[PDB]
Design a binder for this molecule. Structure first.
Ligand SMILES: *C(=N)N[C@H]1CCc2ccc(-c3ncnc4[nH]ccc34)cc21
Length: 272
């Protein structure tokens, strides 16, 4: 059931691209009559990239949570995942902003936090948490996706050091990642603070992390700004308690940031 034959996967459209791979919308149509289910299929477009892609598959296959995109199987070559037609949270917030209130944003925040607490329990560092990588299952249910940069922490170390600087938009990186390429569950907490910012701006492009940080200010300039203690401003009409939580996520030192387990009840308290 977790083995999909290539001949049965029908190409429909492109969902995403980047980091030497692409995600396509396919129909898994073994009957060949266009009645099959839609699936999201990721493929690689080098020998290192092959190892990285195999690692992504092994990570996602071992994750079982209502708040993590579901692994469906492999085609022998491609990673088959469930397709969420509402798409990513970034675009969903822009389209439905007039219908989503603070309570709903707090509901999404709590669900992303629960997914992250679970990832951390699996020793998994996501490294690319952003609203573009969160999928909408329904009006009241989000899931974390895109494990393309995810790493598993060894049992005796709580962080990971990368040799070359990252290739992701720099506005979600923690200072220690910008300065020393150090990643941990605590740098995912920093990124989560930026996701809270994205949620409470409804992913408005005019005050997005890139637009606002660039206005405030390149990698050396952002590191300088952050080290001075400058941060993204509270989003328009943001509840004060939410902005206070973002600032805690953005503590200069990773050991001073709250854990996802500590953030969870704090978000649930604000929701109710
Ligand atoms: C928002 N615009 N998000 C897109 C950025 C690139 C990308 C890749 C894949 C998806 C996606 N959409 C729906 N269902 C899925 N299951 C797994 C991945 C996906 C969305 C985006």
């Amino acid at each position: 059931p977790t083995i999909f034959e290539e001949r049965h996967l029908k190409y429909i459209s492109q969902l995403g691209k980047g980091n030497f791979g692409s995600v396509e919308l396919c129909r898994y149509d073994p009957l060949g009559d266009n009645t099959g289910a839609l699936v999201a299929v990721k493929q690689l477009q080098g020998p290192d990239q092959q190892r990285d892609f195999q690692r992504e598959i092994q990570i996602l296959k071992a994750l079982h949570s209502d708040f993590i995109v579901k692994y469906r199987g492999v085609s022998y070559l491609r990673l088959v995942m469930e397709y969420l037609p509402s798409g990513c949270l970034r675009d969903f917030l822009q389209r439905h902003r007039a219908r989503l209130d603070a309570s709903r944003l707090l509901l999404y925040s709590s669900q992303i936090c629960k997914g992250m607490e679970y990832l951390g329990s699996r020793r998994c560092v996501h490294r690319d948490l952003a609203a573009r990588n969160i999928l909408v299952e329904s009006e009241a249910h989000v899931k974390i996706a895109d494990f393309g940069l995810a790493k598993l922490l060894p049992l005796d170390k709580d962080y990971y050091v990368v040799r070359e600087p990252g290739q992701s938009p720099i506005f979600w990186y923690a200072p220690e990642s910008l300065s020393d390429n150090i990643f941990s569950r605590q740098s995912d907490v920093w990124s989560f603070g930026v996701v809270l910012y994205e949620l409470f701006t409804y992913c408005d492009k005019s005050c997005s992390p890139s637009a606002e940080f660039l206005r405030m200010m390149a990698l050396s300039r952002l590191l300088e700004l952050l080290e001075e203690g400058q941060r993204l401003p509270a989003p328009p009409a943001c509840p004060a308690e939410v902005h206070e939580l973002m600032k805690l996520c953005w503590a200069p030192s990773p050991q001073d940031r709250p854990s996802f387990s500590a953030l969870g009840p704090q978000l649930d308290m604000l929701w109710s």
